[PDB]
Backbone:
């Protein structure tokens, strides 16, 4: 009955967009365990670019989010078939922005919300001057 | 057994500091219902000053926070004895930064965390130039 869902990401400066995505992963099935993976500082910089919060800071905030059942921190940068067996993961929940996951029936797309970013709010604050 | 806890605030640009405070209110007793009250835009401006997110935006984010059981939105700006009977509230959980609540045994102080503000993060981002 219980389905294990894995959602990895940077989760830098967590905002409403991240939270809706996690909500959606959590509710992919009736009974879920949602595991969130938080990428390491070094790897994020190496492939994504500058991260603002540390691994510890990004992991901390996620502990307060209703939908999160377990955290792997830090998590591997790329998911592997062995990683999935290790943690008994049934589906990987990520945005479509991976072929092998779809081929195996293990990919669940989750959607993004624009205009919700911490970056977006300061633009609003400044637009007062 | 179950204790109703009321925590009101603006909750503008929610950050780790707010979340720890809500955690603390939630865990004041073994079995709690935590009610969060979100002040109205107009009243917040009238007494606090400029608010950045709308009532709807501040209420939305709180729906994703693990510790929050119910939301009153908008909530009255000042708590009243009648408001407490209305919602069967046993303790008001707020920071000490109110005499009548203490006198009645209904005040539970909750602490703040500094350096955790959305405001604090941009200062870090800019300190790169």
Residues:
């Amino acid at each position: 009955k219980n389905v294990v869902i894995y959602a990895d990401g940077v989760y830098d400066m967590l905002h409403l967009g991240h939270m809706k995505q996690l909500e959606q992963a959590k509710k992919l099935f009736e009974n879920t365990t949602l595991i969130v993976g938080v990428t390491s500082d070094n790897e994020t910089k190496l492939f994504k670019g500058q991260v603002v919060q540390t691994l510890e800071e990004r992991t901390e905030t996620l502990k307060h989010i209703r939908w999160v059942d377990e955290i792997i921190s830090p998590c591997p940068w790329v998911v592997t078939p062995e990683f999935l067996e290790k943690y008994k993961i049934d589906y990987v929940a990520h945005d479509d922005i991976y072929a092998w996951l779809k081929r195996a029936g293990k990919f669940k797309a989750t959607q993004r919300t624009e205009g919700v970013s911490t970056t977006d709010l300061i633009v609003r604050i400044l637009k007062n001057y």
Notes: Chain B touches chain A at residues 13, 16, 19-20, 22-23, 50, 52-53, 57, 60-61, 63-68, 118, 121-122, 124-125, 128 (CB under 8 Å). The longest helix of chain B spans residues 16-26. Residues 83 and 116 of chain B are 32 Å apart (CA to CA).
